[PDB]
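B., you asked whether I could sanity-check this one before it goes into the benchmark set. Here's the sequence:
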Amino acid sequence: SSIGLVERTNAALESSSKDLKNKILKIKKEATGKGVLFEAFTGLKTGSKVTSGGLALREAKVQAIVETGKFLKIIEEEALKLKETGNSGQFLAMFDLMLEVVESLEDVGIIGLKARVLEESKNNPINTAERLLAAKAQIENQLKVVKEKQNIENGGEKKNNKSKKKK
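And here's what the prediction gave me:
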């Protein structure tokens, strides 16, 4: 019934992918170790909690992308194969997949410009492989730009309440 392989083959690799958004569960404990609280995020006036979290909480938001970059490199050799299949049905899931792993990061105050990547496929028809690599090239290229944001915040990281940003 099986020869060391797996059902539906590991092609989709969607099984291990689900372990990504869940892998964070570990990155969360990191801060907790420093006696950090997930309740004093931002809003408790932060009058006495003047950044009481320390740099141990900010480094956590970054430790994630680092883990994702590792798993993301694995998908490269996965989609590259579908090149022969070119099955939009199977390729379509990939597009929604690479973007999904970015949805669980929102739990760590991480908000990439993914929402913007959605229009990318809307403008250009994504039903092939070759071109697909074009969509990813942006994901990895953009992610590496997010990490640099750790220069000194005052922007994407820790958004100011005054900055409504809605227009």
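One thing to flag: Helices lie at 14-33, 55-82, 88-100, 114-123, 130-147. Otherwise nothing jumped out at me.
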